Amino acid sequence: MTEYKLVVVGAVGVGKSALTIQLIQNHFVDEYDPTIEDSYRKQVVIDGETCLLDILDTAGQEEYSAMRDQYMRTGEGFLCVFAINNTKSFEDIHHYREQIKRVKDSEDVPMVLVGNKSDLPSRTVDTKQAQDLARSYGIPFIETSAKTRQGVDDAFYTLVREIRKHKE
Ligand SMILES: CNCc1cnn(-c2ccccc2)c1
Secondary structure, three states, X not given: OOEEEEEXXXXXXXXXXXXXXXXXXXXXXXXXXXXXXXXXXXEEEXXXXXXXXXXXXXXXOHHHXXXXXXXXXXXXXXXXXXXXXXHHHXXXXXXXXXXXXXXXXXXXXXXXXXXXXXXXXXXXXOHHHHHHHHHHHOOOEEEOEOOOXXXXXXXXXXXXXXXXXXXX
């Protein structure tokens, strides 16, 4: 069984670990607990194919820039999670995109664009802009909602699907 080494990168205000816990024990945590180092492995059946999902959560602060670069090489799938309530994370995606290519040296790399906090009425990021931007990058965009649990499971499925596509 192949282990999929994925890294959940994001800024402060998106709630990265919130999605992970939903996949593990299906619990939506409201509190913001700053993670330092944790890896969650689980056996997920992707379209009938059981795969080992190794997802590591990162820090929202750019304090460990060197540490970020370290596992930026090992990370196969990059989760571009931004928040529609935080326009800053939207612009940060451009920075991460370039940084990823800077350590991968490839015009094509398994990546996914997902927007979280889509349950908040305070929308600062336009859905069209997010969709159009996704087309500009050429990656699938999944609307994720941690509160109503929408675009969560399907996001993981599409993720692995793209990885398999790029692979073979
Ligand atoms: C960096 N120390 C070894 C190690 C363990 N795990 N991963 C890892 C897991 C998922 C995605 C990317 C990397 C790296």
